[PDB]
């Protein structure tokens, strides 16, 4: 019992983290096989970042201008290409610690572990979600770019995020490992305002199921609702619409707890309309939306 | 920018996790050099746990009754002793992945990363604190016992916690790596009620400093207070007393932000008396007390 914001174990990903230096810019790279992945803005001065032409900036760079370091050993760079907003540096040595991995582009509402790195050295690991506005609310200083977001399925690391940008609002934008930004964000020091950070309704429900499973039941009410009726209230509260798909996804938690998804929705409805009145749920004063249904099942069942 | 509940990278500790089986009981062990540490209740049936005599239970156990597995390779057990509430199984092979490590007994209010394991396999990593009632609010199922709590100082893992007990209230008790329980808890399925879970006042202040540093300033007020005056209010709100030591510990955050500790206290005072009024601080509706001043400095500065 007890329910905690839980990152995947970082070990497998620690073994992939290198330091990438181009001129005076140092950030983090992901070393998988004989490729090192890093943000392409490693080639930018902070001045460049105002209006960078990455193809043009790149012409002035050779393999030997990319200094790649794993621990205190330098990797030889034998090739470089730009894929979207990432650089792929071909090194002459396949990472001996390469885990089984995939590159996956996650949907808004999907959670993942971030291994925050500085100079290719891990500082910590936290759990995030891809927000519906395709931002993430990370913890990232200067030098944290190239820090990656991942899921582990038993022994296979699915890389879903590379850290690129702080927005003027101190939220975060980055890419999948093909270099494509989540959302409409760009690797440029320009006006970039996030849209509405809506609450991930299915995640809140998953977490209400987690709460019931761990003995926090005070918010279970006598009401049910409909998808359409619940959704009117969701809209009003900047909650994502709930789909039949979300309901199906919650089925196993519905099954285990014997609370119909729509009854739980009616509980969530009342929590929205009526607030917490100073009570907590799993030690939170707000409705947590950074546990997926899969996160809840995993943590409630003890998958490894 | 952005501030996140951040565990240390788990890699170094993943490399230490083994499966300990005694008869029908399987839980987690910590393999450091040629010793495997696990809770002594590995030798108990759930029936034993009602009133176990561990010395007597132990007499009926030999080295070969302790089945230790690292990945899918069995370790040969060549000795066993009981130290307080842990077993130390001497194995014939020193863990090749033994990191630099210490055993440290932490104080209430100290935070640490937990690597939750099942059958010696890591499932996740979260950040906890030793509560003032010497419980922790973990996430632990059956088979999670022997999961450890740690800090990393650069490359040296300080092991501070081994998981032992769920209390009937679904909070957690365990030992340091010398087998001594935090608090008055015992490895017995008996009535064990925790005392007052008071808020770690210095940790809340550290986190209010973190918030100011990350642009959440709305709660900064025009008031100051005294230790004695603040403490009257702390008492009333089940907050730990604030000591001059706590003030000194917060000095560097005081320095960096230019907010005197006592002014921040006067801010905290008002937050207690007046609540959040539906506002959040670093995306929390309650005052977070599981970041230490050292946690805040680390995460705000980017130590690795
Ligand atoms: C270009 C950029 O945004 N770099 C960055 C990323 N994350 C956190 C802080 C910073 C300065
Ligand atoms: C003896 C004991 O308390 N075992 C345990 C520990 N942590 C979580 C769940 C359980 C059943």
Coordinates of C-alpha atoms and ligand atoms in Angstrom, one line a residue:
Chain A
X1 CA 0.0 0.0 0.0
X2 CA 0.9 3.7 -0.4
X3 CA 1.0 5.3 -3.8
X4 CA 4.0 7.4 -5.0
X5 CA 5.0 9.5 -8.1
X6 CA 7.4 6.8 -9.3
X7 CA 10.0 7.1 -12.1
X8 CA 11.3 3.9 -13.9
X9 CA 14.8 2.9 -12.7
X10 CA 17.3 5.1 -14.5
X11 CA 20.2 2.7 -14.7
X12 CA 19.7 1.5 -18.3
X13 CA 19.4 5.2 -19.4
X14 CA 22.4 6.4 -17.2
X15 CA 24.5 4.0 -19.4
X16 CA 23.6 6.0 -22.5
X17 CA 24.3 9.5 -21.3
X18 CA 27.3 11.4 -22.8
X19 CA 28.6 15.0 -22.8
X20 CA 28.3 16.8 -26.2
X21 CA 30.4 20.0 -26.6
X22 CA 30.3 22.1 -29.8
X23 CA 32.6 25.2 -29.4
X24 CA 31.5 26.7 -26.0
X25 CA 28.1 25.0 -25.8
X26 CA 28.1 21.7 -23.7
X27 CA 24.9 19.6 -23.2
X28 CA 23.8 16.0 -23.0
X29 CA 23.7 13.3 -25.7
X30 CA 22.0 9.8 -25.8
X31 CA 24.6 7.2 -27.0
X32 CA 22.8 4.1 -28.5
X33 CA 24.9 1.7 -30.6
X34 CA 27.4 3.9 -32.5
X35 CA 25.1 7.0 -32.7
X36 CA 25.0 9.9 -30.2
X37 CA 21.7 11.9 -30.2
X38 CA 21.7 15.5 -29.0
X39 CA 19.7 18.7 -29.7
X40 CA 20.9 20.4 -32.9
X41 CA 21.1 23.8 -30.9
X42 CA 24.5 22.4 -29.4
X43 CA 25.9 24.3 -32.5
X44 CA 24.3 27.6 -31.5
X45 CA 25.8 30.5 -29.5
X46 CA 23.0 32.1 -27.3
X47 CA 23.1 34.8 -30.0
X48 CA 22.5 32.2 -32.8
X49 CA 19.4 31.0 -30.8
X50 CA 17.6 34.3 -31.6
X51 CA 17.2 33.4 -35.3
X52 CA 19.4 30.3 -36.1
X53 CA 19.7 28.9 -39.7
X54 CA 20.7 25.4 -38.6
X55 CA 21.6 24.1 -42.1
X56 CA 23.9 27.1 -42.5
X57 CA 25.4 26.9 -38.9
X58 CA 26.0 23.2 -39.6
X59 CA 28.1 23.7 -42.8
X60 CA 30.8 25.4 -40.5
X61 CA 30.9 22.2 -38.4
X62 CA 33.0 19.0 -38.9
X63 CA 32.9 15.7 -37.0
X64 CA 36.0 16.9 -34.9
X65 CA 34.1 20.1 -33.7
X66 CA 31.6 17.7 -31.9
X67 CA 33.5 16.6 -28.7
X68 CA 31.7 13.5 -27.3
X69 CA 32.8 12.2 -23.8
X70 CA 31.5 9.1 -22.0
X71 CA 32.7 9.2 -18.4
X72 CA 36.3 10.7 -18.9
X73 CA 36.9 8.9 -22.3
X74 CA 36.5 10.8 -25.6
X75 CA 34.5 9.1 -28.4
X76 CA 35.7 9.5 -32.0
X77 CA 33.0 11.2 -34.2
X78 CA 33.2 9.7 -37.7
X79 CA 29.9 11.3 -39.1
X80 CA 27.1 13.8 -38.3
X81 CA 23.7 14.4 -39.9
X82 CA 20.8 16.6 -38.8
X83 CA 17.4 14.8 -38.4
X84 CA 14.7 17.5 -37.7
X85 CA 15.8 19.2 -34.5
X86 CA 18.3 16.4 -33.3
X87 CA 21.9 15.8 -34.3
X88 CA 23.0 12.2 -34.8
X89 CA 26.8 11.9 -34.3
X90 CA 28.1 8.6 -35.7
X91 CA 30.9 7.5 -33.3
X92 CA 33.5 4.7 -34.0
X93 CA 32.4 2.7 -30.8
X94 CA 29.0 1.1 -30.3
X95 CA 27.8 1.9 -26.6
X96 CA 28.6 -1.3 -24.8
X97 CA 25.7 -0.5 -22.4
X98 CA 23.1 0.0 -25.2
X99 CA 19.8 -1.4 -23.7
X100 CA 17.1 -2.8 -25.9
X101 CA 15.3 0.4 -27.0
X102 CA 12.7 2.0 -29.2
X103 CA 12.0 5.6 -30.3
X104 CA 8.3 6.3 -29.6
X105 CA 6.3 9.5 -30.2
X106 CA 3.9 9.6 -27.2
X107 CA 0.5 11.3 -27.0
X108 CA -0.5 14.2 -24.7
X109 CA -1.5 12.6 -21.3
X110 CA 1.3 9.9 -21.6
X111 CA 3.7 10.0 -18.6
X112 CA 7.5 9.1 -18.7
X113 CA 10.6 9.3 -16.5
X114 CA 13.1 12.0 -17.2
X115 CA 16.8 11.5 -16.3
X116 CA 17.9 15.1 -15.8
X117 CA 21.7 15.3 -16.8
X118 CA 24.4 18.0 -16.7
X119 CA 27.6 17.5 -18.7
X120 CA 26.4 13.9 -19.6
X121 CA 26.2 13.1 -15.8
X122 CA 22.9 12.2 -14.3
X123 CA 21.6 14.5 -11.5
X124 CA 18.2 13.0 -10.8
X125 CA 15.1 11.2 -12.2
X126 CA 11.5 12.5 -12.0
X127 CA 8.1 11.4 -13.5
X128 CA 6.5 13.8 -16.1
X129 CA 3.6 13.8 -18.5
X130 CA 3.3 15.2 -22.0
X131 CA 0.7 17.9 -21.2
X132 CA -2.2 18.4 -23.6
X133 CA -0.5 21.7 -24.7
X134 CA 2.6 19.5 -25.6
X135 CA 4.7 21.2 -22.9
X136 CA 6.1 19.3 -20.0
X137 CA 6.6 20.7 -16.4
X138 CA 10.2 19.4 -15.9
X139 CA 13.1 20.6 -13.7
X140 CA 15.8 21.7 -16.2
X141 CA 18.7 24.2 -15.8
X142 CA 21.4 25.4 -18.4
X143 CA 23.2 22.2 -19.6
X144 CA 20.2 19.9 -19.1
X145 CA 19.3 19.9 -22.9
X146 CA 19.7 16.3 -24.3
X147 CA 18.3 14.9 -21.0
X148 CA 15.8 12.3 -22.3
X149 CA 12.3 11.0 -21.3
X150 CA 11.6 7.3 -21.3
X151 CA 9.4 4.3 -20.5
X152 CA 10.9 0.8 -19.8
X153 CA 8.8 -2.3 -20.8
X154 CA 10.7 -5.0 -18.7
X155 CA 14.2 -4.6 -20.4
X156 CA 13.3 -2.4 -23.5
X157 CA 13.7 1.4 -23.0
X158 CA 11.2 3.4 -25.1
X159 CA 12.7 6.9 -25.6
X160 CA 9.9 9.4 -26.1
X161 CA 11.5 12.8 -25.3
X162 CA 14.7 14.8 -25.6
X163 CA 14.9 18.1 -23.7
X164 CA 15.4 21.2 -25.9
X165 CA 13.7 24.5 -24.7
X166 CA 12.6 26.4 -21.6
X167 CA 9.6 28.6 -22.6
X168 CA 9.6 32.2 -21.0
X169 CA 6.9 30.7 -18.6
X170 CA 9.5 28.2 -17.3
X171 CA 7.6 25.2 -18.9
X172 CA 9.6 22.9 -21.2
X173 CA 9.5 21.8 -24.9
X174 CA 11.5 19.1 -26.6
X175 CA 11.4 16.4 -29.3
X176 CA 10.9 12.7 -29.8
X177 CA 14.3 11.0 -30.8
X178 CA 13.5 11.6 -34.5
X179 CA 14.0 15.3 -33.6
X180 CA 10.3 16.3 -34.1
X181 CA 9.1 18.8 -31.4
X182 CA 6.1 17.9 -29.3
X183 CA 3.6 20.7 -30.1
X184 CA 4.2 23.8 -32.3
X185 CA 7.5 24.6 -30.5
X186 CA 10.8 25.4 -32.3
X187 CA 14.5 25.5 -31.2
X188 CA 14.5 29.3 -31.3
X189 CA 14.7 32.0 -28.6
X190 CA 11.4 33.6 -29.8
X191 CA 7.9 34.3 -28.4
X192 CA 6.5 30.9 -27.8
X193 CA 3.3 30.9 -25.6
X194 CA 1.8 27.5 -24.6
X195 CA -1.9 27.0 -25.1
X196 CA -4.3 25.8 -22.3
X197 CA -2.7 23.3 -19.8
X198 CA -5.8 21.2 -19.5
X199 CA -6.1 18.4 -16.9
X200 CA -5.7 14.8 -18.2
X201 CA -9.1 13.5 -17.1
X202 CA -8.4 9.8 -17.6
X203 CA -5.2 10.2 -15.5
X204 CA -7.2 11.8 -12.6
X205 CA -9.7 8.9 -12.7
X206 CA -6.8 6.3 -12.8
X207 CA -5.4 8.2 -9.7
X208 CA -8.9 8.2 -8.0
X209 CA -8.9 4.4 -8.6
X210 CA -5.3 4.2 -7.1
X211 CA -6.7 6.2 -4.1
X212 CA -9.6 3.8 -3.5
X213 CA -7.2 0.8 -3.8
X214 CA -5.0 2.4 -1.1
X215 CA -7.9 3.2 1.3
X216 CA -8.5 6.9 0.5
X217 CA -12.3 6.6 -0.2
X218 CA -13.8 9.7 1.4
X219 CA -14.6 11.3 -2.1
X220 CA -16.6 8.2 -3.3
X221 CA -20.3 9.5 -3.6
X222 CA -23.8 8.1 -4.3
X223 CA -24.0 9.6 -7.8
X224 CA -23.3 8.4 -11.3
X225 CA -23.2 10.5 -14.5
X226 CA -23.0 10.1 -18.4
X227 CA -20.0 10.8 -20.6
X228 CA -21.9 13.8 -22.2
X229 CA -22.9 15.1 -18.7
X230 CA -19.5 14.6 -17.1
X231 CA -17.9 16.2 -20.2
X232 CA -20.0 19.5 -19.8
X233 CA -18.5 19.8 -16.3
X234 CA -15.0 18.7 -17.6
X235 CA -15.1 21.5 -20.3
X236 CA -16.1 24.1 -17.6
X237 CA -13.0 23.0 -15.5
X238 CA -10.4 22.8 -18.3
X239 CA -10.4 19.0 -18.1
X240 CA -9.8 17.0 -21.3
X241 CA -12.9 15.3 -22.8
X242 CA -13.5 11.7 -21.6
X243 CA -13.9 9.2 -24.5
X244 CA -15.3 5.7 -24.5
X245 CA -11.6 4.8 -25.2
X246 CA -10.7 6.4 -21.8
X247 CA -13.5 4.3 -20.2
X248 CA -12.3 1.1 -21.8
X249 CA -8.7 1.9 -20.7
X250 CA -10.0 2.3 -17.1
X251 CA -12.0 -1.0 -17.3
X252 CA -9.3 -3.1 -15.4
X253 CA -9.3 -0.6 -12.5
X254 CA -13.1 -0.5 -12.7
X255 CA -13.1 -4.3 -12.5
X256 CA -10.6 -4.5 -9.6
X257 CA -12.3 -1.9 -7.4
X258 CA -15.9 -2.7 -8.5
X259 CA -16.5 1.0 -9.1
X260 CA -18.0 1.7 -12.6
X261 CA -15.9 4.3 -14.5
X262 CA -19.0 6.6 -14.7
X263 CA -19.6 6.5 -11.0
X264 CA -16.0 7.5 -10.5
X265 CA -16.6 10.3 -13.0
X266 CA -19.6 11.4 -10.8
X267 CA -17.1 11.4 -7.9
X268 CA -14.6 13.5 -9.9
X269 CA -17.5 15.8 -11.0
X270 CA -18.4 16.5 -7.3
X271 CA -14.6 17.1 -6.4
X272 CA -14.5 19.7 -9.2
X273 CA -17.8 21.4 -8.3
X274 CA -17.2 21.2 -4.5
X275 CA -13.3 21.2 -4.2
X276 CA -11.4 19.2 -1.5
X277 CA -12.7 21.2 1.4
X278 CA -9.1 21.0 2.9
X279 CA -9.0 17.2 2.6
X280 CA -6.2 15.3 0.7
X281 CA -6.3 12.3 -1.7
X282 CA -3.1 10.1 -1.6
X283 CA -1.5 13.1 0.3
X284 CA -2.4 15.6 -2.6
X285 CA -4.6 18.7 -2.2
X286 CA -5.2 18.8 -6.0
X287 CA -6.4 16.1 -8.5
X288 CA -3.2 14.4 -9.8
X289 CA -3.2 13.9 -13.6
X290 CA 0.4 12.5 -14.1
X291 CA -0.5 8.8 -13.5
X292 CA -1.8 6.9 -16.5
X293 CA -4.2 4.0 -16.0
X294 CA -1.2 1.8 -17.0
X295 CA 1.0 3.7 -14.4
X296 CA -1.7 2.9 -11.7
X297 CA -2.0 -0.9 -12.7
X298 CA 1.8 -1.2 -12.8
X299 CA 2.3 0.4 -9.4
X300 CA -0.7 -1.3 -7.7
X301 CA 0.4 -4.7 -9.1
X302 CA 4.3 -4.4 -8.8
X303 CA 5.4 -4.9 -12.4
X304 CA 9.3 -4.8 -12.9
Chain B
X1 CA 13.6 26.4 -14.1
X2 CA 10.8 24.1 -12.9
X3 CA 11.1 22.2 -9.6
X4 CA 10.3 18.4 -9.4
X5 CA 10.2 15.7 -6.7
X6 CA 13.5 14.2 -7.9
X7 CA 15.0 10.8 -6.9
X8 CA 18.8 10.2 -7.3
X9 CA 19.6 8.0 -10.4
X10 CA 18.9 4.4 -9.3
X11 CA 21.6 2.7 -11.5
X12 CA 24.3 2.2 -8.8
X13 CA 21.6 0.7 -6.5
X14 CA 20.0 -1.4 -9.3
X15 CA 23.4 -3.2 -9.5
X16 CA 23.1 -4.2 -5.8
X17 CA 19.6 -5.7 -5.9
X18 CA 19.2 -9.5 -5.5
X19 CA 16.3 -11.9 -4.7
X20 CA 16.4 -13.6 -1.3
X21 CA 14.2 -16.7 -0.8
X22 CA 13.9 -18.6 2.6
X23 CA 11.4 -21.4 2.2
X24 CA 8.3 -19.9 0.7
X25 CA 9.1 -16.2 1.6
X26 CA 10.9 -14.2 -1.3
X27 CA 12.0 -10.6 -0.8
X28 CA 14.8 -8.2 -1.9
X29 CA 18.5 -8.2 -0.7
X30 CA 21.2 -5.6 -1.0
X31 CA 24.5 -7.2 -2.4
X32 CA 27.5 -5.1 -1.4
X33 CA 31.0 -6.8 -1.7
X34 CA 30.5 -10.4 -0.6
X35 CA 27.5 -9.7 1.8
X36 CA 23.8 -9.7 1.0
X37 CA 21.6 -7.7 3.4
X38 CA 17.8 -8.5 3.7
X39 CA 15.2 -8.2 6.4
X40 CA 15.5 -11.1 9.0
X41 CA 11.7 -11.7 8.5
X42 CA 12.6 -13.6 5.2
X43 CA 12.8 -16.6 7.6
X44 CA 9.1 -16.0 8.9
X45 CA 5.9 -17.6 7.6
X46 CA 3.1 -15.0 7.8
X47 CA 2.1 -17.0 11.0
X48 CA 5.6 -16.6 12.5
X49 CA 5.2 -12.8 12.0
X50 CA 2.4 -12.8 14.7
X51 CA 5.0 -13.5 17.5
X52 CA 8.4 -14.5 15.9
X53 CA 11.4 -15.5 18.0
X54 CA 14.0 -14.7 15.4
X55 CA 17.0 -16.4 17.2
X56 CA 15.0 -19.6 17.5
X57 CA 13.6 -19.4 13.9
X58 CA 17.2 -18.9 12.8
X59 CA 18.7 -22.0 14.5
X60 CA 16.5 -24.1 12.0
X61 CA 18.2 -22.3 9.0
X62 CA 21.4 -23.1 7.2
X63 CA 23.4 -21.1 4.6
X64 CA 21.7 -23.4 1.9
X65 CA 18.2 -22.5 3.0
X66 CA 19.0 -18.9 1.9
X67 CA 18.6 -18.9 -1.9
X68 CA 20.2 -15.7 -3.3
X69 CA 19.8 -14.9 -7.0
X70 CA 21.4 -12.0 -9.0
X71 CA 19.7 -11.8 -12.4
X72 CA 19.2 -15.5 -13.2
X73 CA 22.5 -16.7 -11.5
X74 CA 22.5 -18.2 -8.0
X75 CA 25.0 -16.9 -5.4
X76 CA 26.6 -19.4 -3.1
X77 CA 25.8 -18.5 0.6
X78 CA 28.9 -19.4 2.8
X79 CA 27.7 -17.7 6.0
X80 CA 24.8 -16.0 7.7
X81 CA 24.5 -13.8 10.9
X82 CA 21.6 -11.7 12.3
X83 CA 22.5 -8.0 13.0
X84 CA 19.5 -6.5 14.8
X85 CA 16.6 -6.8 12.3
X86 CA 18.7 -7.5 9.1
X87 CA 20.3 -10.8 7.9
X88 CA 23.8 -10.5 6.4
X89 CA 24.4 -13.5 4.1
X90 CA 28.1 -14.0 3.2
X91 CA 28.3 -15.1 -0.4
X92 CA 31.4 -16.5 -2.1
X93 CA 31.4 -13.7 -4.9
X94 CA 31.9 -10.0 -4.2
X95 CA 29.3 -8.0 -6.2
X96 CA 31.3 -6.8 -9.2
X97 CA 29.0 -3.7 -9.4
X98 CA 29.5 -2.7 -5.7
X99 CA 29.5 1.2 -5.7
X100 CA 31.4 3.2 -3.2
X101 CA 28.9 3.1 -0.3
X102 CA 28.3 4.0 3.4
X103 CA 25.6 2.9 5.9
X104 CA 24.1 6.1 7.5
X105 CA 21.3 6.4 10.0
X106 CA 19.4 9.5 8.9
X107 CA 17.4 12.0 11.1
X108 CA 13.6 12.6 10.8
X109 CA 13.2 15.2 8.1
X110 CA 16.0 13.7 5.9
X111 CA 14.8 12.7 2.4
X112 CA 16.1 9.8 0.3
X113 CA 15.4 7.9 -2.9
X114 CA 13.7 4.4 -2.6
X115 CA 14.3 1.9 -5.4
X116 CA 11.1 -0.3 -5.0
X117 CA 12.0 -3.9 -5.9
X118 CA 10.1 -7.2 -6.4
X119 CA 12.0 -10.5 -6.6
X120 CA 15.3 -8.5 -6.6
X121 CA 14.1 -6.7 -9.8
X122 CA 13.7 -2.9 -9.7
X123 CA 10.1 -1.6 -10.4
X124 CA 10.5 2.1 -9.8
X125 CA 12.2 4.9 -7.8
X126 CA 10.5 7.6 -5.7
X127 CA 11.7 10.3 -3.2
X128 CA 10.7 9.9 0.5
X129 CA 11.5 11.5 3.8
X130 CA 12.0 10.0 7.2
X131 CA 8.8 11.4 8.9
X132 CA 9.2 12.9 12.4
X133 CA 7.1 9.9 13.6
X134 CA 9.9 7.7 12.0
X135 CA 7.5 6.3 9.4
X136 CA 7.9 6.8 5.7
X137 CA 5.0 7.2 3.2
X138 CA 6.3 4.8 0.5
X139 CA 4.7 2.7 -2.2
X140 CA 5.4 -1.0 -1.2
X141 CA 3.5 -4.2 -2.0
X142 CA 4.1 -7.9 -0.8
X143 CA 7.7 -8.8 -2.0
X144 CA 9.0 -5.1 -1.7
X145 CA 10.8 -5.7 1.7
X146 CA 14.6 -5.3 1.4
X147 CA 13.9 -2.4 -1.1
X148 CA 16.5 0.2 0.2
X149 CA 16.5 4.0 0.6
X150 CA 19.7 5.9 -0.4
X151 CA 21.5 9.2 -1.1
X152 CA 24.3 9.5 -3.6
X153 CA 27.2 12.0 -2.9
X154 CA 28.7 12.1 -6.5
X155 CA 29.7 8.4 -6.7
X156 CA 29.2 7.2 -3.0
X157 CA 25.8 5.7 -2.2
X158 CA 24.8 6.3 1.4
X159 CA 22.2 3.5 2.3
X160 CA 19.9 4.9 5.1
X161 CA 16.8 2.6 4.8
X162 CA 15.8 -1.0 4.2
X163 CA 12.0 -1.6 3.8
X164 CA 10.5 -4.1 6.5
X165 CA 6.9 -3.3 7.6
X166 CA 3.6 -1.9 6.4
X167 CA 1.7 -0.5 9.5
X168 CA -2.1 -1.2 9.6
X169 CA -2.5 2.5 8.5
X170 CA -0.5 1.7 5.2
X171 CA 2.5 3.8 6.3
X172 CA 5.9 2.1 6.3
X173 CA 8.6 1.2 8.9
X174 CA 12.1 -0.1 8.2
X175 CA 15.7 -0.1 9.4
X176 CA 19.1 1.4 8.6
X177 CA 21.5 -1.1 7.1
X178 CA 22.7 -2.1 10.7
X179 CA 19.2 -3.5 11.1
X180 CA 18.0 -0.9 13.7
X181 CA 14.4 0.2 13.1
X182 CA 13.7 3.9 12.6
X183 CA 11.3 4.7 15.5
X184 CA 9.8 2.3 18.0
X185 CA 8.7 -0.2 15.3
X186 CA 9.5 -4.0 15.4
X187 CA 9.4 -6.7 12.7
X188 CA 6.2 -8.2 14.2
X189 CA 2.5 -8.4 12.9
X190 CA 1.3 -6.5 16.1
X191 CA -0.6 -3.3 17.0
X192 CA 1.8 -0.5 15.9
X193 CA 0.3 2.9 15.8
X194 CA 2.5 5.8 14.5
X195 CA 2.6 9.1 16.5
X196 CA 1.9 12.5 15.1
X197 CA 3.0 12.9 11.4
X198 CA 4.2 16.5 11.9
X199 CA 5.3 18.7 8.9
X200 CA 9.1 19.2 8.5
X201 CA 9.1 23.0 8.9
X202 CA 12.7 23.6 7.5
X203 CA 11.8 21.5 4.4
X204 CA 8.7 23.6 3.8
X205 CA 10.9 26.8 4.0
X206 CA 13.5 25.2 1.7
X207 CA 10.6 24.5 -0.8
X208 CA 9.2 28.1 -0.4
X209 CA 12.8 29.3 -1.3
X210 CA 12.7 26.8 -4.3
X211 CA 9.3 28.4 -5.3
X212 CA 10.6 32.0 -5.2
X213 CA 13.7 30.9 -7.2
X214 CA 11.3 29.4 -9.9
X215 CA 9.0 32.5 -10.0
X216 CA 6.2 31.3 -7.7
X217 CA 6.2 34.5 -5.4
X218 CA 2.5 35.2 -4.8
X219 CA 2.8 34.1 -1.1
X220 CA 5.7 36.5 -0.3
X221 CA 4.2 39.0 2.3
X222 CA 5.2 42.2 4.0
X223 CA 5.7 40.5 7.4
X224 CA 8.5 39.1 9.4
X225 CA 8.3 37.1 12.7
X226 CA 10.6 35.6 15.4
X227 CA 11.5 32.0 16.0
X228 CA 9.5 32.0 19.2
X229 CA 6.5 33.7 17.5
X230 CA 6.6 31.5 14.4
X231 CA 7.0 28.4 16.6
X232 CA 3.7 29.2 18.5
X233 CA 2.0 29.1 15.1
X234 CA 4.0 26.0 14.0
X235 CA 3.0 24.1 17.2
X236 CA -0.7 24.9 16.6
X237 CA -0.4 23.5 13.0
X238 CA 1.6 20.3 13.9
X239 CA 4.7 21.7 12.3
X240 CA 8.1 20.8 13.8
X241 CA 9.8 23.5 15.9
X242 CA 12.2 25.7 13.9
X243 CA 15.7 25.9 15.5
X244 CA 18.5 28.4 14.8
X245 CA 20.2 25.3 13.3
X246 CA 17.3 25.2 10.7
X247 CA 17.9 28.9 10.1
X248 CA 21.6 28.4 9.5
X249 CA 20.9 25.5 7.2
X250 CA 18.6 27.8 5.1
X251 CA 21.2 30.6 5.0
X252 CA 22.5 29.8 1.5
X253 CA 18.9 29.9 0.1
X254 CA 18.3 33.1 2.2
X255 CA 21.5 34.6 0.6
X256 CA 20.6 33.6 -3.0
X257 CA 17.0 34.9 -2.8
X258 CA 17.8 37.9 -0.5
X259 CA 14.8 36.8 1.7
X260 CA 15.7 36.6 5.4
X261 CA 14.7 33.1 6.8
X262 CA 12.4 34.8 9.4
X263 CA 10.5 36.8 6.6
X264 CA 10.0 33.5 4.8
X265 CA 8.7 32.1 8.2
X266 CA 6.2 35.0 8.3
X267 CA 5.2 34.0 4.8
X268 CA 4.7 30.4 5.9
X269 CA 2.9 31.6 9.0
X270 CA 0.3 33.4 6.8
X271 CA 0.0 30.4 4.5
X272 CA -0.9 28.3 7.6
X273 CA -3.3 30.8 9.1
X274 CA -4.9 31.8 5.7
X275 CA -4.5 28.6 3.6
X276 CA -3.8 28.6 -0.2
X277 CA -7.2 30.1 -1.1
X278 CA -7.2 27.7 -4.1
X279 CA -3.7 28.8 -5.4
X280 CA -0.8 26.4 -5.9
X281 CA 3.0 26.7 -5.1
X282 CA 5.3 24.8 -7.5
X283 CA 2.0 23.1 -8.7
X284 CA 1.1 21.8 -5.2
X285 CA -2.1 22.7 -3.2
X286 CA -0.3 21.9 0.1
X287 CA 3.1 22.9 1.6
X288 CA 5.7 20.3 0.5
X289 CA 8.0 19.1 3.3
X290 CA 10.0 16.3 1.4
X291 CA 12.6 18.6 0.0
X292 CA 15.6 19.4 2.4
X293 CA 17.5 22.6 2.1
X294 CA 20.3 20.4 0.5
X295 CA 17.7 18.9 -1.9
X296 CA 16.7 22.5 -3.0
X297 CA 20.3 23.7 -3.4
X298 CA 21.2 20.5 -5.3
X299 CA 18.2 20.8 -7.7
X300 CA 18.4 24.6 -8.1
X301 CA 22.2 24.4 -8.8
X302 CA 22.3 21.1 -10.9
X303 CA 24.8 18.9 -8.8
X304 CA 25.5 15.4 -10.3
Ligands
LIG1 C1 17.6 27.2 -25.2 C2 17.1 26.8 -23.9 O1 15.9 26.9 -23.7 N1 18.0 26.2 -22.9 C3 17.4 25.8 -21.6 C4 16.7 24.6 -21.5 N2 16.2 24.2 -20.4 C5 16.4 24.9 -19.3 C6 17.1 26.1 -19.2 C7 17.6 26.5 -20.4 C8 18.4 27.8 -20.5
LIG2 C1 5.4 -7.9 7.1 C2 5.0 -6.7 6.1 O1 4.7 -5.7 6.6 N1 5.1 -6.9 4.7 C3 4.8 -5.8 3.8 C4 5.6 -4.7 3.7 N2 5.4 -3.7 2.9 C5 4.3 -3.7 2.2 C6 3.3 -4.8 2.2 C7 3.6 -5.8 3.1 C8 2.7 -7.0 3.2

